Design a binder for this molecule. Structure first.
Ligand SMILES: C[C@H]1CC[C@@H](O)[C@H]1NC(=O)[C@H](Cc1ccccc1)C[C@H](O)CN1CCN(C(=O)CCc2cccnc2)C[C@H]1C(=O)NC(C)(C)C
Lengths: 99, 99
């Protein structure tokens, strides 16, 4: 797919059998999802955004399907404005910026 | 060019004669730059993201050169930790997301 940026690059992701909307974000190093229950243990992580830092819970080896493309990696869960798909998962699905 | 996401998508921009390094961010609706002096009248604006909201100065119709490509648009100036090139200018240089 080729996605133009006249609108927000929102896609549907499936995680835990649920469909959610997520923002393809090249300016995000990590993938940060809104509050939800993920399996296993979690480790602590502090991430800095535009307004400062927030504490998130990191889960490893989580399966997440982005537009029919399966990816397995680190997902952070916390008080985020929207579900964000960062570079860690963007590289797994073969996403690039072109101009 | 084609830019991979293994590393942060940083590019050189020229604004007001000054050369700066900025991030090509598809998740950003706007373009926000670190504190600097731009000519003209500005308007106070409040923008938010991870960590909360920050107060910025809104300058309209500013010309920026992103890798030679010229683009005109609104640029917000404020306490951002990284210079961000958002969707408002990314569209002007024909930037697209592919996978
Ligand atoms: C993802 C994080 C993990 C670690 C960092 O990588 C970090 N990345 C970022 O936060 C980067 C900036 C950064 C890069 C590198 C180092 C430090 C900081 C910004 C992000 O790509 C864009 N971001 C997405 C989520 N957003 C939304 O949904 C807004 C919705 C909304 C709703 C109602 C009212 N207002 C807003 C806010 C938006 C943002 O910040 N946009 C502006 C115009 C402010 C820049």
């Amino acid at each position: 797919p080729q996605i133009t940026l006249w609108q927000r690059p929102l896609v549907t992701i499936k995680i835990g059998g649920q469909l959610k909307e997520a923002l393809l974000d090249t300016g995000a190093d990590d993938t940060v999802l809104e509050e939800m229950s993920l399996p296993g243990r979690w480790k602590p992580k502090m991430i800095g955004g535009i307004g400062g830092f927030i504490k998130v819970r990191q889960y490893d080896q989580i399966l997440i399907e982005i537009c029919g493309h399966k990816a397995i990696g680190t997902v952070l869960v916390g008080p985020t404005p929207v579900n964000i798909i960062g570079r860690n998962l963007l590289t797994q699905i073969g996403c690039t910026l072109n101009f």
